[PDB]
Design a protein around this ligand. Sequence first.
Ligand SMILES: Cc1cc(CN)c(C)o1
Ligand SMILES: [Ca+2]
Length: 223
Amino acid sequence: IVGGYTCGANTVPYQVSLNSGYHFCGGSLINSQWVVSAAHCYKSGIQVRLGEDNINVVEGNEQFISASKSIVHPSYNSNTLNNDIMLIKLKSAASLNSRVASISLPTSCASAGTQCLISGWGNTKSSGTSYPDVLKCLKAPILSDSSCKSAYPGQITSNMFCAGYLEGGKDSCQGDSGGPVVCSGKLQGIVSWGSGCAQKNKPGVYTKVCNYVSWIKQTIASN
Ligand SMILES: Cc1cc(CN)c(C)o1
Ligand SMILES: [Ca+2]
């Protein structure tokens, strides 16, 4: 997250870190045994880390649970990043509490102008490289489909939306991949892609979660 703020320990209780020897992606806990992330975060050997603030220090509220299975969306295209969504099942159910909690799926799509919270352990620099240890947060509005398409000619599908600031300065970045965009207590987006970070007229692009609720529910119900 570039141009954000330090969230505060366990203030974003649905935020997970995906770890394969190191943090490589964010995710969102949607029930006691399932995480939603980006399909571009797919790899084998995933451990889900919940209750994290400082990802380099065991602070006492963590639960570390290995993934038993991952399900990449059947229509995910890695070139275009269309349908950039994946489900991860935990080998055992997380113990839910005030610091480890699920986030509700949307019942309807959020509109341009809706204020959301984006979070992650990604790069905090727009030019250089600096990775924070503690979770960073950014309040950002959803941008109109028209401005999103104008920002990225030929690249925005019906499964994507832009959020952030056309002036730049405040954005998601590398390492935030797969993490949450939460608006009014609903998971509306997944950190997906962009062009650099916090650059003028290049806002973050997010997977449009409301399009996938039926798939998520049916997949969970049979797996
Ligand atoms: C994970 C990620 C988010 C964004 C949006 N600035 C980029 C380039 O990479
Ligand atoms: Ca920790």
